[PDB]
Design a protein around this ligand. Structure first.
Ligand SMILES: O=[P-]([O-])[O-]
Length: 576
């Protein structure tokens, strides 16, 4: 087992002298490694879930040893229901070791090879190498942990017991299963993406150079409807997308969404592409579409939140401050739980509606004055591989990115309001950051000329290097907005997958048709002016519902925070 050479992270080394940030970092390393080797917990919703689980375990371990005043542990040690009962410390008094035990046990439980009975799903089998690569990440982390790991300490053992409770309660090992799901083709209907209709996978994952079999992937079609939610207190729902159900009559909106999709999301060289070079950069910056050495969007959102956390920390000392430890333990629990539930509800809605992606909608439109049967997108970047850009293997509405960003950045806003500045709950903040680099645009990662070599550093492999782009942002509101519209620029989402067009685009005197510049490129409202307020109807449910991923994530974050981070009541979990 030759270890994957992981490239340098653009972050100050001082961050990992904090033990809360250190274990977050280990979680992110496992995220990017698992997406390089084909391990467990791949894909956006489940990778979010792993981080939520990590940070809940860290949170309750830490706050058992260091009791907070403004909130409580997520689980109570006094609960009668065994499944929800937090272990007691019984003399254990070392928070650093409690956190190490919780983090290590949780991450080992999540990423280790399952023992006996051969727990492996046919078509979703994981190689021995993949588990070994992840094991090495964990082993290396033990030696790097600031202040060390003492496995014999009572506090460490207490942390492990905390992890065991959370793992038993919240793990969903087969949550991403696709057994029995099949597309139902037709107008507006999700189906195999035409540039990647089938993939060849090894018959035996431990013989990768051996015989192959075709596979049609559908990412987690049952997860949203069946999995246990973390901290939400209701079910969340979106308006019918234009073209479907109660909004089947929104023809002007749908037709203009097609026009905008072509102009803003097409391949670089197409005569019909009106996107600017800067908008390409905005598209790629936020991608993290499961690529080698990069992982999934929750990894990027955590990288950003680490910078926010250190920028706005209350004490200078990252190593020896209980104020900083408590601050980070609480923030990352709030953020990664919100990211988890955002994954659940975005997936639930995605598979409820089964709305097609722009590539298929544009190609299969069927009307000469609207469609283009030969259109190509900029696409989800296939970074650190020789593969062509793609369409993520799940339905369009709402965008996962949009929802995750809504939840993560609204949570950051609720947490820091009063501290960094003051704003109304739904208005722009001043949580600015600088020197923020995306691994999609870092001067190191690349579009390779040949298949990725997992035994060599990325810099030693021929390819076209991604330009290094160092960013500043004014606010979490800006982060949330740009993250959402990035997907329009890639051509992987409709405008309404992000938010109501009315809330992000500039209107004209024609209803549902939005402004373009002299070249036909879409104009956006200024960040300071953006309000996610525009609602729509549902065929199956009375009332007014948000449109697209951003307001879905916002509402999830607000509900979680308003309830002080407490578990979803057992009685409202899915049962069926
Ligand atoms: O759901 P999406 O942002 O590819």
């Amino acid at each position: 087992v030759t270890p994957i050479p992981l490239p340098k992270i653009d972050e100050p080394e001082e961050y990992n002298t904090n033990y809360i940030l250190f274990w977050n970092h280990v979680g992110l390393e496992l995220n990017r490694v698992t997406h390089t080797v084909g391990g467990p917990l791949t894909g956006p919703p489940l990778s979010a879930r792993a981080l939520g689980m990590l940070h809940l375990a860290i949170h309750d371990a830490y706050f058992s040893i260091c009791p907070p005043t403004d909130f409580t542990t997520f689980l109570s040690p006094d609960t009668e229901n065994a499944a929800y009962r937090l272990p007691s410390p019984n003399g254990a008094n070392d928070a650093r070791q409690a956190v190490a035990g919780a983090a290590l046990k949780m991450l080992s439980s999540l990423y280790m090879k399952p023992v006996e009975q051969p727990n492996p799903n046919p078509g979703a089998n994981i190689s021995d190498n993949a588990y070994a690569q992840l094991g090495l990440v964990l082993d290396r982390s033990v030696l790097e942990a600031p202040g060390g790991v003492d496995r014999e300490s009572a506090s460490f053992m207490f942390g492990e017991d905390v992890a065991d409770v959370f793992f038993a309660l919240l793990n969903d090992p087969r949550g991403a299963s696709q057994e029995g799901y099949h597309p139902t083709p037709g107008r507006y209907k999700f189906d195999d993406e035409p540039t990647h209709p089938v993939v060849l996978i090894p018959v035996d994952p431990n013989n990768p150079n051996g015989p192959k079999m075709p596979f049609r992937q559908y990412h987690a079609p049952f997860y949203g409807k069946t999995t246990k939610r973390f901290a939400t207190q209701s079910e969340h729902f979106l308006a019918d997308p234009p073209g479907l159900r109660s909004n089947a009559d929104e023809t002007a909106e749908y037709d203009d969404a097609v026009r905008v999709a072509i102009a803003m999301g097409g391949a670089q060289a197409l005569n019909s592409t009106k996107r600017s070079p800067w908008q390409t950069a905005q598209g790629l910056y936020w991608a993290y579409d499961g690529s080698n050495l990069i992982g999934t969007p929750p990894r990027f959102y955590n990288q950003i939140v680490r910078r926010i956390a250190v920028t706005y920390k209350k004490e200078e000392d990252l190593a020896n401050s209980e104020v900083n430890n408590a601050d980070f333990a609480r923030l990352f629990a709030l953020v990664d739980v919100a990211c988890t539930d955002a994954g659940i509800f975005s997936w639930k809605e995605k598979w409820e509606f089964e709305f097609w992606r722009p590539l298929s909608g544009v190609r299969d439109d069927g009307r000469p004055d609207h469609g283009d049967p030969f259109w190509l997108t900029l696409g989800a970047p296939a970074t650190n591989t020789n593969d062509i850009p793609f369409k993520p293997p799940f339905p369009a509405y709402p965008s996962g990115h949009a929802t995750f960003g809504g939840a993560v950045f609204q949570m950051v806003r609720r947490y820091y309001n009063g501290r960094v500045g003051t704003w109304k709950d739904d208005e722009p903040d001043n949580i600015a950051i600088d020197m923020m680099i995306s691994e999609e645009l870092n001067g190191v990662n690349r579009d390779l000329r040949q298949p990725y070599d997992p035994t060599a550093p990325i810099e030693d492999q021929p390819g076209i290097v991604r330009t290094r782009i160092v960013r500043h942002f004014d606010s979490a509101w800006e982060l949330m907005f740009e993250n959402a519209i990035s997907r329009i620029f890639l051509g992987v989402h409709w405008r309404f997958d992000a938010a109501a067009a009315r809330d992000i685009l500039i209107p004209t005197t024609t209803k549902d048709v939005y402004a373009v510049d002299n070249n036909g490129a879409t104009v956006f409202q200024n960040v300071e002016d953006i309000r996610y307020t525009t609602r729509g109807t549902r065929e199956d449910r009375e009332g007014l519902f948000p449109i697209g991923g951003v307001p879905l994530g916002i509402e999830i974050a607000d509900e979680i925070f308003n309830n002080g981070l407490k578990p979803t009541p057992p009685e409202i979990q899915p049962m069926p």
